[PDB]
Design a protein around this motif. Structure first.
Motif, short mmCIF file in Angstrom:
data_model
loop_
_atom_site.label_atom_id
_atom_site.label_comp_id
_atom_site.label_asym_id
_atom_site.label_seq_id
_atom_site.Cartn_x
_atom_site.Cartn_y
_atom_site.Cartn_z
N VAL A 20 0.82 -1.18 0.00
CA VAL A 20 0.00 0.00 0.00
C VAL A 20 0.86 1.24 0.00
O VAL A 20 0.68 2.14 -0.78
CB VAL A 20 -0.98 -0.04 1.19
CG1 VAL A 20 -1.61 1.30 1.46
CG2 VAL A 20 -2.03 -1.11 0.99
N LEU A 24 1.57 4.24 -2.97
CA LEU A 24 1.40 5.64 -2.75
C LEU A 24 2.68 6.42 -3.00
O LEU A 24 2.63 7.54 -3.46
CB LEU A 24 0.82 5.84 -1.37
CG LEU A 24 -0.54 5.23 -1.08
CD1 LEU A 24 -0.84 5.22 0.40
CD2 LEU A 24 -1.64 5.94 -1.86
N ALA A 27 2.95 6.66 -6.76
CA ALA A 27 2.05 7.62 -7.33
C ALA A 27 2.59 9.02 -7.26
O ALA A 27 2.35 9.79 -8.14
CB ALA A 27 0.69 7.50 -6.69
N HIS A 28 3.35 9.34 -6.24
CA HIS A 28 3.99 10.63 -6.15
C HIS A 28 5.15 10.67 -7.11
O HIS A 28 5.37 11.65 -7.74
CB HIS A 28 4.46 10.85 -4.71
CG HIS A 28 4.64 12.27 -4.32
ND1 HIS A 28 5.80 12.96 -4.56
CD2 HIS A 28 3.82 13.12 -3.68
CE1 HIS A 28 5.68 14.19 -4.11
NE2 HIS A 28 4.48 14.32 -3.57
N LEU A 54 -1.18 -1.39 -5.24
CA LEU A 54 -2.38 -1.04 -4.51
C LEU A 54 -3.53 -1.81 -5.02
O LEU A 54 -4.65 -1.58 -4.63
CB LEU A 54 -2.63 0.46 -4.59
CG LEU A 54 -1.90 1.38 -3.64
CD1 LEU A 54 -1.76 2.73 -4.30
CD2 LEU A 54 -2.70 1.52 -2.37
N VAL A 78 2.58 6.83 5.60
CA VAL A 78 3.55 7.19 4.60
C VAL A 78 3.64 8.66 4.26
O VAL A 78 2.64 9.33 4.10
CB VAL A 78 3.42 6.30 3.34
CG1 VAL A 78 2.20 6.63 2.51
CG2 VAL A 78 4.70 6.27 2.54
#
Ligand SMILES: [Fe+3]
Ligand SMILES: [Fe+3]
Ligand SMILES: [Fe+3]
Ligand SMILES: [Fe+3]
Ligand SMILES: [Fe+3]
Ligand SMILES: [Fe+3]
Ligand SMILES: [Fe+3]
Ligand SMILES: [Fe+3]
Ligand SMILES: [Fe+3]
Ligand SMILES: [Fe+3]
Ligand SMILES: [Fe+3]
Ligand SMILES: [Fe+3]
Ligand SMILES: [Fe+3]
Ligand SMILES: [Fe+3]
Ligand SMILES: [Fe+3]
Ligand SMILES: [Fe+3]
Ligand SMILES: [Fe+3]
Ligand SMILES: [Fe+3]
Ligand SMILES: [Fe+3]
Ligand SMILES: [Fe+3]
Ligand SMILES: [Fe+3]
Ligand SMILES: [Fe+3]
Ligand SMILES: [Fe+3]
Ligand SMILES: [Fe+3]
Ligand SMILES: [Mg+2]
Ligand SMILES: [Mg+2]
Ligand SMILES: [Mg+2]
Ligand SMILES: [Mg+2]
Ligand SMILES: [Mg+2]
Ligand SMILES: [Mg+2]
Lengths: 173, 173, 173, 173, 173, 173
Positions: A20, A24, A27-28, A54, A78
């Motif tokens: 997870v 994330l 994605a950044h 994810l 996170v």
């Protein structure tokens, strides 16, 4: 009989969390690849990996837990507080993370065999395999950064890589 | 000219965070719906909503930020430490969360008009709309829990709801 | 009742003029891109933008005026007396012009809300959206000039960009 | 050898300007035809002519200039300060403008033969032809205004004219 | 949170009533157009508008109310006690009614922004748009009555208008 | 000869009014079925009946009047001031209204035979038939409320009823 191993439950809840959080982070990193590094296709590559983490990587753990008596835990923390300096270093960081996944998975597999959880050793086989496959995909991109000094040549090679019909390898795909 | 509003950036980074965390909560709630409450289709309904939140709801913010100069922030903290007692209460909690989203979005829209960020008011319109649509979908399921005492009758109604071809309403879809 | 705002009429006649003149500037810039800078596809990109400005961007204003009582004015003055030095600067100039459009449109939208011309605020929404979309398209090309030193690599990336089937983004397309 | 004639360059830059300005005048005249004269199809006829002038008629000059060494100039000044009184007079004005085009083109052709620019005489042949074709199309509409006193009968005849599949004449199309 | 505005509820119940009553007036006006004025296609045009008002225009209000907590009220009073003298005046009356709708809708939109009901401002956008579209359709017919003295020529133009495939305009359709 | 009966004209203007008002009552009852009673398909059933009453049931009267010399009157007054307590009572009210229609139609038919209006007796035959058909459809739903205590079981039976291809009975359809 057939009572769940608490240890495997814990390790797989830990793998769920890693998946997870990695997603994330990816994605950044995908956003930054385009926004700051002007590499939209490296961004699409990393976004696809965010969605894998994810998605399926987490899905199977939950499905497994529903079948065996294991409990799911959701504890996620996170923060992306630093960003790599350039695009080569961003993919290199992704690589390092993927390599770590391989070590974490090795540990779940060794644990299963020690706990005689054969259902769990079977389940981890997907992750032993995707560990190497996912690293191979990332390495293929890292290679390009050492093969050209032109970002647009690299970008076009990534584009083709993303738009390939993903034909699975017999052992690793 | 055209310099990003820092306030909108902050509110939208806050909406990004809410969407990520909601999705992760919905993923646990989906698991519990099946695992503990024996309602696999309520689980699929909530999983679809988890994917909406961790997908499009977050995607557009990042895309927008790439177009206007706004910075993305990734700071996520979520733990599911308590679970609702039954399935009716689980969907009722989802509802409450969706209702809150509607208030948060109203605030971004009021801010945009006060900041004269017309591009941002346009962007929020998707979320003003999905706010009501998403609540309507959840309310339709909540209704069932007060319309039958049989979990299998409810489950079959949810199944049909999920397997409908999702034809959009002219204003709200 | 329903009497046209003279102010909006004036601002939209001013936007009509800007769109006509921009298109004519872009038509020269497209010619120069090929003729002088040896970049035929950057030329096709800018020609497509000239046609957007001298087409739909102007069409809708006239259509709107026919529906509400507003008067069209045609007063056009444009001369291209200086040309940018290189191709990077040409696309950078296009960018600056697109950014200005965004500020002009913000002003029509603020005016509409102050004049309570809700039909006019609705009409401007297309332009609030195309403002960002059009800038995004131009920025994508500008990026390339800072991503490669080879004009032919850039040219090939533009070619692909032009020959893409233009699939609209849900909010911005 | 093969050095561009400066005179032809000037005359063709002048024809480019005429075509741009005519198109912009026709775009206003099209608007007025519908808005004020209640003739939407006469408007569509004139809009189609605006697009011809601001399109192909200008496109070819620029293309030609790119092939031969000639320079493009963009200096445009146009204002519609008076409008004709009725629809018959509007199409009659369009006619007069088209007739003038024919005289301007004759002059480019005489110049080419005097300058021994045979490539330029070849290029003008399109315009010698479209000159008569474009006048013929306009004359066909003018005729109607002297053939009926009913605007709706005329409008229906124009509609059919516009919705014809435009089959080219062997010499003139 | 998210508690319905009573004012918007009242204004939209008032718009529901207007739409119902307008439709019933248009149904009589359609009948009279054929029966008394010998214009069957003007009748079909007005019947189509009756059905729009007693259909979608009312449907959406009820749907909206079901989603937000607003209450529907049904209080309808309408009597057609006078009929216009001729067909031109009948379409002119329809026009006046459509123009009034535009003012009523402006008021709902101003109210929403003052009440910070952004969901309601979004909902009204359909009606801000259809307000102008519906007026444009009616104006197109009114124009004909001033463009011909023959009822059969007008009738044939209306027929074609009705039998057109209704392709929506990008902003207004 | 063939001069319209004023009595039939009056009775049919009265039936037109009943059909309009019934439809408007059914539109509120449909809304309440979903909104308050959580029965969306009972709502769709009643909405379909609202549209029948405000459509064909009224259409034919107007068409008939256009053919025979009879005058249409539009005088409508309806207010829903009380709502039934539950869903069973709502469908039971619809039933009572449909049963009354049957008595009203019997009266038009007896009148026609007494007035020797054979064209009018023929016209009423549709309504003598739809009277029983419409009651039969409503009775089929009422039956369900006495056949189950579960609203979701009833809802699913109504859904199937609505989504049936409506094959007409030889005498009654
Ligand atoms: Fe991009
Ligand atoms: Fe993959
Ligand atoms: Fe062992
Ligand atoms: Fe993977
Ligand atoms: Fe299952
Ligand atoms: Fe969905
Ligand atoms: Fe303000
Ligand atoms: Fe959503
Ligand atoms: Fe070329
Ligand atoms: Fe485009
Ligand atoms: Fe105001
Ligand atoms: Fe554009
Ligand atoms: Fe028109
Ligand atoms: Fe043509
Ligand atoms: Fe000579
Ligand atoms: Fe031409
Ligand atoms: Fe007829
Ligand atoms: Fe329509
Ligand atoms: Fe305010
Ligand atoms: Fe409408
Ligand atoms: Fe519903
Ligand atoms: Fe039916
Ligand atoms: Fe008798
Ligand atoms: Fe019926
Ligand atoms: Mg333990
Ligand atoms: Mg700040
Ligand atoms: Mg003024
Ligand atoms: Mg010279
Ligand atoms: Mg009140
Ligand atoms: Mg009488």
């Amino acid at each position: 009989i057939m009572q769940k191993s608490n240890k495997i439950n814990d390790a797989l809840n830990q793998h769920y969390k890693l998946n997870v959080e990695l997603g994330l982070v990816y994605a950044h990193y995908a956003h930054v690849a385009d926004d700051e590094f002007d590499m939209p296709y490296l961004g699409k590559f990393i976004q696809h990996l965010s969605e894998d983490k994810l998605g399926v990587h987490k899905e199977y753990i939950s499905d497994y837990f529903k079948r065996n008596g294991m409990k799911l835990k959701t504890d996620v923390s996170v923060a992306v507080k630093s960003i790599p300096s350039d695009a080569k270093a961003l993919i290199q960081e992704v690589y390092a993370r993927e390599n770590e996944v391989r070590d974490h998975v090795k540990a779940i597999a060794k644990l299963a065999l020690a706990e005689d959880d054969y259902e769990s050793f079977y389940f981890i086989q997907w992750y032993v395999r995707d560990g190497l496959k996912d690293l191979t995909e990332v390495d293929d991109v890292v290679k390009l950064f050492n093969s050209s000094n032109d970002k647009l040549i690299i970008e076009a090679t990534i584009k083709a890589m993303v738009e390939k019909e993903e034909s699975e390898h017999e052992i690793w795909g």
